[PDB]
Design an enzyme around this catalytic site. Structure first.
Site, short mmCIF file in Angstrom:
data_model
loop_
_atom_site.label_atom_id
_atom_site.label_comp_id
_atom_site.label_asym_id
_atom_site.label_seq_id
_atom_site.Cartn_x
_atom_site.Cartn_y
_atom_site.Cartn_z
N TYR A 1 12.77 -47.51 23.87
CA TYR A 1 13.83 -48.41 24.33
C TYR A 1 13.58 -49.00 25.69
O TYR A 1 13.94 -50.16 25.94
CB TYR A 1 15.18 -47.70 24.38
CG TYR A 1 15.86 -47.63 23.04
CD1 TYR A 1 15.40 -46.77 22.05
CD2 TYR A 1 16.94 -48.47 22.73
CE1 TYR A 1 15.99 -46.73 20.80
CE2 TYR A 1 17.53 -48.44 21.48
CZ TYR A 1 17.05 -47.57 20.52
OH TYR A 1 17.62 -47.53 19.28
N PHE B 1 22.54 -36.91 23.62
CA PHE B 1 22.53 -36.85 22.16
C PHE B 1 22.63 -35.42 21.63
O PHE B 1 23.18 -35.20 20.55
CB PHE B 1 21.30 -37.57 21.60
CG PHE B 1 21.23 -39.04 21.98
CD1 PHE B 1 22.40 -39.74 22.34
CD2 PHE B 1 20.01 -39.72 21.99
CE1 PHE B 1 22.35 -41.09 22.71
CE2 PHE B 1 19.94 -41.08 22.36
CZ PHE B 1 21.12 -41.77 22.73
N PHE C 1 30.74 -43.79 28.39
CA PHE C 1 30.11 -43.41 27.12
C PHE C 1 30.57 -42.04 26.65
O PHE C 1 30.90 -41.85 25.48
CB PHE C 1 28.59 -43.36 27.27
CG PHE C 1 27.88 -42.92 26.01
CD1 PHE C 1 27.74 -43.79 24.94
CD2 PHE C 1 27.35 -41.63 25.90
CE1 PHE C 1 27.07 -43.39 23.76
CE2 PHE C 1 26.68 -41.22 24.73
CZ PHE C 1 26.54 -42.11 23.66
N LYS D 1 25.82 -49.41 24.23
CA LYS D 1 24.88 -50.45 24.60
C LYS D 1 24.95 -50.73 26.10
O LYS D 1 23.93 -51.04 26.71
CB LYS D 1 25.12 -51.74 23.82
CG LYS D 1 24.43 -51.78 22.47
CD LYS D 1 25.00 -50.75 21.53
CE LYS D 1 24.00 -50.36 20.46
NZ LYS D 1 24.70 -49.71 19.33
N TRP E 1 13.08 -48.01 15.84
CA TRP E 1 13.79 -46.75 15.76
C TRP E 1 14.71 -46.70 14.55
O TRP E 1 14.74 -45.69 13.85
CB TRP E 1 14.62 -46.51 17.03
CG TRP E 1 15.47 -45.27 16.93
CD1 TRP E 1 15.06 -43.98 17.13
CD2 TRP E 1 16.83 -45.19 16.51
NE1 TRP E 1 16.09 -43.11 16.86
CE2 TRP E 1 17.19 -43.83 16.48
CE3 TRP E 1 17.79 -46.15 16.16
CZ2 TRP E 1 18.46 -43.39 16.10
CZ3 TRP E 1 19.07 -45.71 15.79
CH2 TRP E 1 19.39 -44.35 15.76
#
Ligand SMILES: [Mg+2]
Ligand SMILES: [Mg+2]
Ligand SMILES: [Mg+2]
Lengths: 306, 295, 292, 295
Positions: free
Chosen positions: D55, D75, D141, D169, D286
């Site tokens: 990324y 994550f 987030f 994002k 991905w």
């Protein structure tokens, strides 16, 4: 043809409304460039500081003027943008953003620029933490005003969602907290997001209801996109195929449902041991905003005019 | 708990409802094929003819019975298709269309067939021109009783526009014209389009309001659509929609007045639109009291 | 300039286009009231031949005539109130039915009358089958639509029921003498909605520029705003969407056969809709009707 | 097979992927409390640092590791929040916020706390102003990680506008900026708001395209929405949506040229916009290879 359905919300007015409305107003008539006497008079007619005192009746005695100044200037700009394209309106608003944060001194020859500057400087000088908390919600509001969404197809659902920003829900909330010196924790705010979202539709629609004629007019007279008619009254009228006035009466009833919802969500917050003293102060503050907003909307000449 | 808001309309039932109800209930009891004495009783208490009289209170005394018989068999069939697959139901109603037209004889051993055949033959014998006129509206509805919906994102405006074209309401509208002997010209029906659409939405939303409780169990209703667009409970949605319905009743009157304020109202039209008024109030009382929406 | 994506659909044109075009265009030039006028430059008869390549040789002229007058009437209408025109067309319907006689001094009337009498004299039963489709279209050409917030799904669903496209469908059946039973005319509801949508979006793609001379209500503008891309980019994406409807057409067909059998009529009809889609595309790309 | 349409964009991996992945994976294998050997093999095979380098291929050489660590713990936490209630989840992340701020001391006996604490302390030590700059985007987030999804009527335009504002994002854009050492002023950022909106959408839809089958075991995705709106199969929808993504790619290029043409493209912004371009191509690779979308 528009008898407000009954409500349990009773608005309150800040005791110093008289005084505050005196200084603020004099200030603008003094520094804000008026097109003519006909404009400065209508300015005084709208009663912008009385809306502020109606919205924040429990504000601290030495902070209520800050609120009347910010809302007033935002209203003044709000109308200016109606004669501009989304592109012009955006540029006008974007130059004021750096000035609001105090990162760009104002062209003292342009009232809107130094007015914005001084105001935010005054507020930071009084209480920086809370002052700064209003910055992004105001910037959020400003960018919604000329957002491209303004023209894309939108039903009731999507509109209420976009209106939260265009109506300035967040700005008003932070302004209320600043003015009342009511500090909440990053977890107390999170706990009241459903309450804020519910309150935002109520503010938005009540305003749409009373400001419809005014907007219908600038719709046929102002700029093609700047004065674009974007309101729940028009949306519901078209979706149900009824007159605008019929739409107002249905939307009004819906507002009462949001009021009931407010009461229910609060009792919920109170039911679960989550209603902290600050929150109680806040949720009750929102109620004042909803009723204050309605009362002003029902009376101001800003909504009874050509 | 759901309190209807004020209305200038009131429900009305056909004068001869008692007489006709016995007449039509008997006929179907004598001919319809009920699986048991239980279903028979259930059928009697459903009173499809009393409902019909509620919807067409202004029908002519000697035509009202045709209306109760038609809706009774359609309703019996509706309920019947429930226990049938979609491919089965479609061929089922599809075999009844030529029979309804009189182009195909019925097997006198299958009641739905001869009841349908005889019913239509009797209607044409009373008023051929007007009977023929409701053939397609009935067929459009019968074919709709078996087709699907195919879901898609849909808001208030979309849902309401869809109900304005509801074939069931178009049937009720056509059947009412037949019942009242109202022979409307294409010119007359065209000027009554907004009124018809307005009425169709009111009947549909009122149904939605009262059928929500039932439908909710395991999808496309003004109740759920408004609740999610406004983010309120289904119950709050019902109250807002109810006011909207009163708005459509006001639009109805305004529209009738505007049509009259012009040289447009006609004797037939005047009777027609009033008839619609009673369909709206009638449908509200039915939605409020039918078992179709119970439990 | 806007490269249409690959397509398996090849348009065809009716064998007699040249013969039919002279007769019909000639007949109208020698009778119609529209004073200067690029009529013979206006496909009409040639456009009708692009849509119904397989119309029966003795019925193709009927279709060209019906569409020519309907389109001329539609062209007129733009000069009269939504009610002057509403009454205008509302008069023609009884004449169309044969019930009322035509004022022989009024062109549109006797032409309407003569035309339908002809159709009934050729195939009474089928000629009557499309009386309604045409009436829906005529009544539909003068009515007004109430503005409403419309997304892409709403717009597309609306075009699925386009009366103009249903008219093309029925008229094709008539022109090809295809007699479908209500059972078959129920088995293709999906193929029809998909076709109507395809015809509409292709028109949208090519008429957007002219139309912008303005409100609108077109898939091009609707998709550009929902996706926040230019109209030109929206045309490309819509064109691919069209190729997907073409693909779905072939699937709904292959399925029908695999299902309770197609039918010789349905096999014909379905192939017909394909010609309408491809024909409509070639027409859209070349008509001056979309010129600025 | 789907067969992605042509793109002028291509995926690129950070030059030090092997090194960083070994380093970061190692750290978490040593500190993170994995339930069992199977959870450890799963962790190494998912390669979060590898995804991260895909990324942010342009990250500065001595900063890519922070990004890998931050996304890896974020994550791991993500996968964990699913097995606990919204209240357990929210309380879990809320406890980490003041800790990530460096305001509350971690309980060294709890991996997630000292891992989070040490991670933010190291970032601040390396660039405190820039580290402080990404605190809120990360907290936004984290809080969104346990938020409740409102099910409401939503068309394509509504769904995309909603994705233009995706907090994940914005996190990616914010973290990339930190990783590239790009100190962009509020004014520079505002100049690329249309570019960020466009990019966020591309990322979300490409995810949508590939995650659909798994999502199909309240489905809110562009694939289902477009499939129902255009009445086509999900596969066809994926196909149209992919073309739509290439249009957003061209739009990105047009917005970047305008920026330069108006003399608004500073050195940092040029670096920024190209960064986004690799986020789009990277996210695409991905999405086509991640096991997170297997079944
Ligand atoms: Mg305004
Ligand atoms: Mg405004
Ligand atoms: Mg307003």
């Amino acid at each position: 043809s528009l008898e407000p359905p009954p409500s349990t919300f009773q608005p309150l007015c800040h005791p110093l409304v008289e005084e505050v409305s005196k200084e603020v107003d004099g200030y603008f008539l003094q520094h804000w460039n008026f097109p003519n006497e006909k404009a400065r008079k209508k300015f005084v007619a709208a009663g912008f500081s009385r809306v502020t005192c109606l919205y924040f009746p429990k504000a601290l005695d030495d902070r209520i003027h800050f609120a009347c100044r910010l809302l007033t200037v935002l209203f003044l700009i709000d109308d200016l943008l109606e004669y501009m394209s989304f592109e012009e309106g955006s540029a006008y608003n974007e130059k004021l953003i750096p000035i609001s944060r105090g990162d760009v001194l104002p062209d003292r020859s342009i009232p809107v620029e130094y007015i914005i500057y001084d105001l935010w400087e005054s507020m930071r000088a009084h209480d920086r933490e809370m002052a700064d908390e209003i910055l992004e919600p105001v910037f959020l509001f400003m960018r919604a005003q000329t957002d491209r969404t303004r023209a894309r197809p939108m039903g009731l659902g999507g509109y209420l969602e976009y209106r939260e920003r265009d109506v300035g829900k967040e700005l008003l909330a932070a302004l209320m907290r600043f003015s009342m010196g009511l500090k909440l924790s990053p977890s107390e705010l999170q706990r009241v997001r459903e309450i804020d979202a519910n309150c935002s539709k109520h503010l938005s629609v009540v305003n749409d209801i009373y400001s419809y004629e005014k907007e219908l007019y600038t719709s046929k007279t102002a700029h093609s996109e700047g004065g674009i008619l974007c309101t729940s009254v028009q949306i519901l009228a078209q979706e149900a195929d009824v007159t605008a006035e019929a739409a107002k009466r249905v939307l009004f009833v819906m507002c009462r449902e949001w009021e009931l919802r407010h009461q229910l969500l609060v009792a919920r917050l109170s039911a679960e041991g989550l209603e902290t003293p600050g929150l109680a102060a806040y949720v009750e503050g929102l109620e004042y905003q909803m009723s204050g907003n309605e009362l002003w909307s029902q009376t101001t000449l800003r909504y009874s005019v050509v």
